[PDB]
């Protein structure tokens, strides 16, 4: 129908072309007469007739008179909708500069003339002359002049030239200059420029000039002379309110501008003095500025009631502007609202609906059905009978409701499952029912929550809300494969109470024919629900491919478990309904049923399980009583002993033995220990203490306490809350983040004191106030993440690439956080994974990995498996299908087209609500110690000593899997040796954390190179070791003479020769860092491992995730090695330490300035590699990307996010993080232009440059080299491909001005540029239609 849109600066002739008339009269309408004024802002002649096919004089009133402009009233008779399309223009008497092109950040009107903004502000406001056409003078064309100085210039220069004033002067300056002329001289100046800052400013200016000269623009157009007016119906207007017509809108600004212009015209034809004309022109400019954007100046023009009245620019941007209020989120018809109800009976594919609501929703359908029946002759009669609510209407309504899904939409739909479909079931009452099992995905309580009901109208919508949105279609959440319909509160408790055992209940030891008989033996009351018995069960097996094998063995279980057997389908084995069946067991049971039985036999199972759970939680009578919450007897004694211990520490502090801080820490620690002790006592008196008879003596058995059963089953609450119900509350936090000295020693079953409640209110207030910020920040993070990806769609089925990011299990030193069987599952390998037996290809290179493959991978025990990921895919404008892996919603490869750009953004921004906003290392288990890339040196004590910090302590068993990882300090001493099996419990590394050892690579004597005792090292008398210890003076503390010299240690023999490092000619030089306490003397042999110098020595909240995605530079960035080379110094920290790194192969032009306070873990004798760390500290994403490729920034920016998300327990699959990473580093920069037409300094999208260079290489000419770049989400979104895609996200004024100046046409092709326009989005079912249409072109 129409191609993409384009935006360009509006020419003064185009505005005249647009307008239908010309407004000269400020008054909108006569107050006395409703009809609008002839020259008024509301005008019949200009902006069409007021009523349909009616003039103003009433001469013509019928359609036969259409198209003929009346001569009496003067309005061209036509429909009223023409009143929202016609436009009018005011003719300003003095040229007026646009405010959007003046006060914006780069200030294009300033960049176009190369003059300060302040001078333009002065001349634009009639207080400073600017020289125009200076000629052969001492005044330049860009010179700023003052009134008195202008008068002096007039007296001095008799020639007729004179500096102008006002916006006319700027317009004349813009017209006089030639854009094409300055380009060549600017290019020459840039080439001759000796610096990069000046050349960068020149590149900005030259880019602006090129943008102007390419598109069809005229700089003079930035100063509008004729100004258009909005159409009348576009004015909000006032409804009849008794005769006031009052509201604050644009009409005030339009009236004031017209008044100012008319006054200016009158003054100009009256030959007013310049002192008055200048003031009038300044007032007119201020009025135009206020109209276009009220508030771009310091003064904000305001009407009555002292409120800043809205302007045009205020009705585009912001949460109130069109782009986020009327274009994206349109309110819809055929809607509804009501409160929630349990709705237990309806199956999980249907939901309730009040009759009094479904009658109003489906009104047109009822009209159509009545017309078909012949009951109503016309629509009027149908409306009458519908309002009658008689018997026939309900029968009709029970037809249009049969198979018509409706969308039950929750209010804050954070993720995809928020809005689901349901099949209506008409009920009485006035509340919307809801299947209980779906009250978890909605996160919908029943404390009066409110859902909104929508209706699909078209046939395609009805089919879509059936094939995609029905509650039986999305069982597994898109964030992770785990099911989302896990039984939640009552059904789980009922199942847990069903699956248990009491050691002596009636009907113990009996033999039962089968579950059909067990249900009867329990209903009769002859046998209790829990009783260990012997039953026979027909366990069906799917071991034969596609066949069900029936085996029956006399299995021993309880009556309750046996009754539960009939509910489960036949395929599942019996090793699932035999255990205690908490909550996680139920979720795993559902998952296995889905995995090995499909979907159709899992919906029925999950619907039947709720019925059984409710029915056997109702018979249980699981009530809570006071006697349940037992207070352990040990609590009083523990309290008394803790009081005694704190009193002892208090007496010690009063004796001066201990410090205040030390005593405070001791008190906190002992109180924590006492709290843990009392909690353990209460738990042991809660779970085990039940004792009963086994037909003989007493026996022990897990408790039946209701409070305990609501915690073990996981139905509601954990052990932490029960700790607050029976044991002591513990230590509470002050509002400032400190721990109060005295913990609350009273539980909730007991009385709580006044002080122990006033203390407790601090935490409640803080936690309740944090909701109003956690949600406010998670919303913004989710919005940025959505609008940064927003366009990823799986369009191609195979990239065909080869490289994929590595995948390895992640361990922090404890138990393995994530096995390789968890992360890898659902993805596709890159290279052929090999069996541990070499030259054996276990799995091909391009096969997807499902469960039957991960099980095989467990047998061979392989740790490193290459996996293709969406960061290395090469398909432009969309990721591949293979590169994305399993859809994670249905266990098959993702279909060609699914919108994965928004799925990941929703799945990452969803857990942002529950997320919190804020020696000796002992081995875990027996195994062999393996040190990767270690340079071990044997010390005097015989203990293993690592040379560099980069070596990490790891343990390897017979399977080769790293059980743990330990960070160890540089030059430390380790108890155990590498390549040696160690026992569990004992520490493999022991060292003093305060002391930093400084060991040498090789053994030998010490020689003080470039060292003088008293210049670089000042010997400090040590009162402990009995010997003055050589202490290195700090670089900023030592004298400048010693600054030139470099304090170092050299290894030498017994004769005096210098011993070279093995491999390198230059001898090993060990630079002694400042404030190093060396025990040995100058000329004493060093043991390889002995400590030469004993030197005394994240935020898991949402801000960490935000800073990670934003690619913000850390506060103290660790510097790295750009190119592999040998470390060298060029200066002596003259203001800053100087570092020069040169490769042994090629000479280096790269020298690095180093701050003098940054410790250098490298030595000038050491040779660094590319990407090697120089100074320790946090790393910067920008540095990593340009040093270690693109694959390396992912392994960090995904590991850190997962580390943040693992603490709270939430799980998000890695690919959802990876697509955001891919959308971040989408822009690229070209190092050299090559044969392409791109200017070397400009930034172009990676896809465009990749396609361009590939096409160039298709011919003889070589392509352009490129360097990848990283941008934060909030800056990458604003610099996207389309201007209208980023003009609805943030900073509307800047984006629109930048687009208009450059004439940046759009191409749509996105998911928001099509939502705004209102056509088929190219995301889902519309992808085929868009593909087709593209093929048409």
């Amino acid at each position: 129908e129409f191609d993409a849109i384009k935006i360009a600066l509006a020419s003064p002739d185009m505005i005249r072309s647009w307008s239908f008339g010309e407004v000269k009269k400020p008054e909108t309408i006569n107050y006395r007469t409703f009809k609008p004024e002839r020259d008024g802002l509301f005008c019949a002649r200009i902006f069409g007739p007021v009523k349909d096919y009616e003039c103003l004089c009433g001469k013509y009133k019928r359609l036969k008179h259409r198209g003929v402009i009346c001569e009496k009233c003067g309005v061209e008779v036509t429909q009223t909708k023409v009143r929202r399309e016609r436009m009018g223009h005011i003719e300003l008497a003095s040229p007026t500069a646009h405010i959007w092109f003046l006060k914006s950040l780069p200030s294009r009107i300033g960049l176009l003339l190369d003059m300060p903004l302040r001078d333009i502000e002065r001349v634009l406001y009639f207080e400073s002359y600017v020289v125009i056409e200076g000629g052969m003078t001492n005044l330049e064309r860009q010179q700023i002049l003052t009134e008195e100085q202008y008068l002096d210039a007039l007296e001095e220069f008799g020639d007729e030239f004179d500096a102008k004033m006002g916006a006319e002067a700027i317009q004349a300056l813009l017209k006089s200059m030639d854009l094409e002329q300055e380009c060549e001289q600017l290019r020459e100046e840039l080439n001759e420029t000796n610096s990069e800052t000046k050349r960068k400013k020149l590149t900005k200016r030259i880019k602006l000039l090129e943008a102007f000269v390419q598109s069809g623009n005229k700089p003079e157009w930035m100063i509008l002379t004729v100004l258009p007016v909005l159409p009348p119906d576009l004015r909000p207007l006032v409804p009849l309110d008794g005769g006031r017509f009052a509201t604050s809108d644009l009409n005030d600004l339009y009236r004031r501008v017209i008044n100012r212009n008319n006054r200016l015209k009158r003054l100009l034809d009256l030959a007013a003095p310049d002192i008055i004309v200048r003031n009038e022109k300044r007032m007119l400019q201020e009025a135009v500025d206020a109209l276009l954007d009220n508030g771009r100046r310091g003064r904000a023009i305001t009407g009555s009631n002292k409120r800043p009245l809205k302007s045009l620019a205020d009705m585009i941007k912001g949460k109130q502007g069109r782009f986020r209020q009327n274009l994206l989120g349109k309110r819809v018809d055929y809607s509804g609202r009501s409160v929630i109800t349990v709705g237990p009976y309806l199956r999980l594919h249907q939901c309730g609906l009040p009759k009094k609501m479904a009658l109003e929703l489906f009104k047109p359908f009822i009209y159509g059905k009545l017309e078909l029946r012949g009951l109503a002759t016309t629509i009027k009669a149908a409306k009458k009978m519908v309002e009658r609510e008689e018997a026939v209407v309900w029968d009709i309504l029970d037809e249009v409701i049969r198979e018509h899904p409706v969308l039950l939409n929750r209010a804050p739909t954070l993720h995809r499952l928020g809005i689901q479909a349901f099949e209506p079931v008409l009920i009485e009452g006035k509340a919307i029912q809801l299947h209980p099992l779906v009250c978890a995905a909605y996160n919908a309580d029943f404390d009066g929550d409110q859902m909104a009901v929508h209706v699909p109208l078209t046939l395609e919508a009805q089919l879509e809300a059936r094939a995609l949105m029905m509650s039986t279609n999305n069982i597994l959440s898109p964030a992770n494969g785990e099911p989302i319909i896990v039984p939640s509160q009552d059904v789980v408790l009922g199942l847990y109470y069903m699956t248990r055992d009491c050691v002596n209940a009636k009907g113990e030891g009996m033999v039962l024919t089968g579950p059909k008989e067990a249900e009867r033996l329990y209903r009769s009351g002859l046998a209790s629900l829990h009783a260990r018995v012997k039953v026979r069960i027909t366990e069906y097996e799917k071991d034969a491919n596609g066949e069900l094998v029936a085996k029956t063995s006399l299995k021993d279980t309880t009556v309750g478990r046996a009754i539960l057997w009939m509910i489960v389908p036949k395929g599942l084995p019996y090793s699932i309904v035999n255990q205690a069946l908490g909550k996680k067991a139920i979720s795993k049971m559902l998952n296995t049923c889905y995995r090995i039985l499909g979907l159709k036999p899992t919906v029925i199972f999950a619907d039947q399980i709720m019925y059984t759970g409710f029915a056997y939680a109702a018979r249980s009578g699981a009530s809570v009583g006071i006697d349940d919450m037992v207070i352990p007897e040990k609590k009083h004694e523990i309290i008394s002993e803790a009081e005694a211990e704190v009193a002892e520490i208090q007496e010690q502090f009063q004796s001066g033995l201990v410090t205040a801080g030390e005593r405070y820490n001791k008190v906190i620690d002992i109180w924590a220990a006492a709290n843990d002790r009392v909690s353990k006592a209460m738990m042991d008196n809660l779970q085990t203490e039940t004792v009963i008879n086994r037909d003989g003596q007493e026996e022990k058995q897990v408790s039946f306490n209701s409070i305990y059963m609501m915690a073990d089953s996981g139905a509601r609450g954990s052990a932490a809350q029960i700790r607050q119900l029976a044991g002591m509350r513990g230590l509470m936090a002050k509002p400032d983040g400190s721990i109060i000295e005295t913990p609350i020693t009273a539980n909730f079953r007991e009385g709580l004191n006044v002080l122990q409640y006033f203390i407790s209110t601090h935490g409640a207030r803080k936690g309740l106030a944090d909701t109003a910020l956690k949600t406010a920040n998670s919303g913004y993070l989710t919005r940025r993440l959505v609008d940064v990806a927003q366009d990823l769609v799986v369009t191609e089925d195979d990239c065909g690439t080869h490289e994929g990011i590595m995948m390895t299990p992640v361990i922090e030193g404890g138990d393995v956080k994530e096995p390789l069987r968890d992360r890898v599952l659902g993805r596709v390998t890159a290279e052929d994974v090999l069996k541990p037996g070499t030259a054996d290809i276990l799995v091909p290179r391009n096969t997807l990995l499902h469960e039957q493959w991960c099980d095989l991978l467990e047998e061979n025990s392989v740790d490193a498996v290459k996996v293709r990921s969406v960061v290395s895919c090469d398909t432009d404008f969309g990721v591949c299908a293979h590169c994305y892996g399993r859809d994670l919603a249905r266990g098959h490869i993702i279909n060609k087209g699914e919108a994965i750009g928004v799925i990941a953004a929703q799945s990452i921004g969803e857990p942002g609500t529950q997320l919190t906003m804020r020696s000796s290392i002992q081995v875990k288990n027996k195994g062999s110690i393996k040190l990767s890339n270690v340079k071990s040196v044997v010390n005097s004590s015989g203990k293993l000593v690592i040379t560099s910090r980069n070596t990490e302590l790891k343990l390897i068993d017979e399977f080769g899997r790293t059980k743990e990882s330990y960070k160890v300090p540089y030059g430390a001493v380790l108890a155990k040796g590498d390549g040696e099996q160690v026992a569990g419990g004992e520490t493999v590394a022991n060292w003093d954390p305060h002391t930093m050892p400084v060991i040498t690579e090789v053994s030998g004597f010490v020689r003080f190179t470039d060292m003088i005792d008293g210049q670089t090292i000042t010997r400090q008398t040590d009162e402990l070791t009995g010997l003055s210890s050589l202490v290195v003076l700090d670089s900023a503390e030592r004298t400048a003479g010693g600054k030139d010299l470099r304090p170092a240690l050299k290894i030498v023999d017994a004769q005096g020769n210098d011993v070279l490092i093995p491999g390198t000619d230059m001898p090993a030089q060990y630079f002694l860092p400042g404030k190093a306490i060396v025990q040995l003397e100058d000329g004493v042999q060093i043991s390889s491992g002995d400590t030469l110098a004993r030197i005394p020595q994240i935020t898991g909240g949402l801000p960490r995730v935000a800073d990670l995605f934003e690619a913000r530079r850390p506060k103290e960035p660790a510097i790295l090695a750009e190119i592999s080379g040998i470390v060298s110094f060029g200066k002596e920290t003259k203001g800053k330490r100087r570092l020069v790194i040169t490769p042994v192969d090629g000479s280096d032009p790269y020298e690095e300035m180093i701050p003098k306070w940054r410790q250098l873990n490298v030595f000038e004798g050491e040779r660094v590699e590319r990407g090697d760390v120089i100074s320790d500290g946090p790393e910067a994403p920008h540095d990593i990307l340009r040093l270690r490729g693109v694959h390396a920034v992912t392994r960090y920016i995904v590991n850190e996010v997962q580390d943040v998300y693992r603490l709270q327990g939430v799980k998000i699959n890695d690919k959802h993080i990876e697509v955001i990473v891919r959308q971040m580093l989408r822009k690229a920069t070209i190092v050299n232009a090559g044969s392409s037409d791109f200017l070397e300094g400009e930034q172009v999208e990676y896809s465009r440059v990749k396609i361009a260079n590939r096409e160039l290489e298709a011919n003889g000419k070589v392509g352009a080299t490129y360097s990848r770049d990283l941008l934060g989400i909030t800056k990458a979104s604003l610099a996207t491909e389309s201007f209208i895609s980023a003009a609805s996200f943030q900073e509307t004024t800047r984006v629109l001005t930048e687009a208009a100046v450059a004439g940046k046409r759009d191409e749509l092709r996105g998911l928001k540029e099509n939502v705004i326009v209102g056509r088929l989005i190219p995301a889902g079912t519309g992808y085929a239609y868009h593909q087709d249409r593209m093929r048409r072109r």
């Binding site: 993409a4 258009p228 576009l234 309110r331 819809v332 018809d333 009901v453 929703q906 519309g1326």
Partner: protein, 99 residues
């Protein structure tokens, strides 16, 4: 309970006019559009955005199509976009549509 099918519209022809004592349709807010885009559903999104909300030649067409018997659709183009075009064109910036 508030549900409505058809009724009075606003100046920007966003028909629901705001659910209150006066008739209104619950806002298909910004996040609900993302929740629709997450699925493959686009036709229902188009009918939430064009025919239901604001399309002067879409509402009066489908109100006749439904009672006729066929559930078809014609997108038109939202009046809010024709408002945004005017609010940018009246700013001294010429924004148009190609063909």
């Amino acid at each position: 309970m508030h549900a409505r099918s058809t009724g009075s519209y606003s100046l920007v022809t966003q028909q629901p006019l705001g659910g209150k004592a006066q008739f209104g349709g619950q806002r298909f807010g910004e996040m609900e559009v993302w929740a629709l885009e997450a699925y493959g559903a686009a036709y229902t999104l188009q009918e939430m955005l064009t025919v239901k909300s604001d399309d002067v030649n879409g509402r009066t067409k489908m109100y006749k199509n439904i009672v006729d018997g066929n559930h078809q659709m014609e997108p038109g183009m939202p009046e809010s976009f024709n408002v945004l075009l005017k609010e940018i064109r009246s700013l001294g910036i010429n924004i148009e549509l190609e063909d």
